[model samples]
Target: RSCIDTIPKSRCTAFQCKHSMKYRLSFCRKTCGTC
Candidate 1:
């Protein structure tokens, strides 16, 4: 996604925070079918 790609490498902390938040949200929505 462009949102992920646009994050600069210098902002590693921010990037990791955003990535974890997004990944958890998306994982629940699309891959939590068994729960």
Candidate 2:
């Protein structure tokens, strides 16, 4: 299965990778929350 399968596509599609999660959370902590 693809990485997207492991993590919901809705989350993966928003960013390139989990690294993006950090940047997103850094700016919008309340919205993104934990991955």
Candidate 3:
């Protein structure tokens, strides 16, 4: 989260890799709230 939490909130999408999702059966959310 240091990478996302370190950068600006407006750059989450372009940041690349929103963490696990397909494998975990979850979804990528904005900010560091819902991974």
Candidate 4:
């Protein structure tokens, strides 16, 4: 959770990304999105 969290909020750009799969914080079987 922290590794990706380290990403700057500015660069993180968690506002509706063009991509979905990797845009999420984690790559698991659980739900994802909101990036």
TM-score of every candidate relative to the true structure: 0.23, 0.25, 0.27, 0.26
User: For model 1, how does the per-residue alpha-carbon lDDT over 1-35 read when each residue is reduced to its tens digit?
Assistant: 21333334344354444457543344332232212
Q: How accurate is candidate 1 locally (lDDT)?
A: 0.37
Stretches > 4 Å off in candidate 1:
1-12, 22-35
Total backbone clashes of candidate 3, pairs 3 or more residues apart or in separate chains = 0
Per-residue lDDT over 1-35 for candidate 3, one digit per residue giving the tens place of the 0 to 100 score: 32224445454443343454432222224443444
For model 3, what is the alpha-carbon lDDT of residue 14? Answer: 31
Candidate 2 vs. truth: CA RMSD?
Answer: 9.9
Q: Candidate 3 local accuracy as lDDT?
A: 0.39
What is the per-residue lDDT of model 2 for residues 1-35, given as tens digits with 9 covering 90 to 100?
11113344455434544457553444334334433
Give lDDT: candidate 2, residue 2: 15
The candidate scoring highest on lDDT is 2
Model 2's lDDT to the true fold?
0.41
Q: Residue 7 in candidate 4 has what lDDT?
A: 41
Candidate 2 — which residues are off by over 4 angstroms? 1-19
Better of 3 and 4 by TM-score: 3
Which pairs of residues collide in candidate 4?
Answer: none
Which clashing pairs does model 2 show?
none
Ranking by TM-score: 3, 4, 2, 1
Q: How many clashing pairs does model 4 include?
A: 0
